[PDB]
Amino acid sequence: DLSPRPSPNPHP
Amino acid sequence: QSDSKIEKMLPDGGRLVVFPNGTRKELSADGQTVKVMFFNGDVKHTMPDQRVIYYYAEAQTTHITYPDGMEVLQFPNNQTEKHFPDGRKEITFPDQTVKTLHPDGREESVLTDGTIIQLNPDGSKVIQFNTGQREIHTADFKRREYPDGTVKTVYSDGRQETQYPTGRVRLKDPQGKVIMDTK
């Protein structure tokens, strides 16, 4: 893949 | 995709590969271990024990993927989330409450005292206490079930029904006046 993973979001 | 790639050779026989987009990859001599250092600061290490460990530089978060499919994310605020392959998620908040989100839309929290709260997708709640007491909340009333079999319900208009363990039912108006009694 070579590309970064999308930034993740915590649950509120 | 990438063609304009550069490989170098480590004294141990491992490889370093540098990609035009800035990504660097380190492969051990046996090829079995891989370290990927992305241009954005992220880091991905695959492990001997088979965990894949990913670090998000900007969000400051680590993300472990385990061999059974579980993913586990550890966030800067000390919150942790476990994501399961059927879509279930288990969130541990800073204050050590655990909440599970199930596929169907149920949520289920367990409090530091073991009290359990269950939030159905229709909006209704069930609380279950250590004492054996349950409360049921819907949009029309709140119902308490006691261990002795007593059930008290307060409706949204303020009328209160008690049902005694014997079966007798007393209904009171908002003011407290009995308006119905099943004797």
Numbering used by the authors:
A (entry chain C): 414 to 425
B (entry chain A): 941 to 1123
Provide the authors' original text about this structure.
Of particular interest in this regard is the putative centriolar CPAP–STIL complex, as mutations in both components result in MCPH. CPAP and STIL are strictly required for centriole assembly: STIL at a very early stage and CPAP slightly later, possibly by controlling the organisation and length of the centriolar microtubules. Instead, we demonstrate that the TCP domain of CPAP constitutes a novel proline-rich-motif (PRM) recognition-domain that specifically binds to a short target motif in STIL. Our mutational analysis of the interface demonstrates a remarkable correlation between the ability of mutant proteins to bind to one another in vitro and their ability to support centriole assembly in vivo, providing compelling support for our structural model of the metazoan CPAP–STIL complex. These data strongly suggest that the interaction between CPAP and STIL is a conserved, essential step in centriole biogenesis.
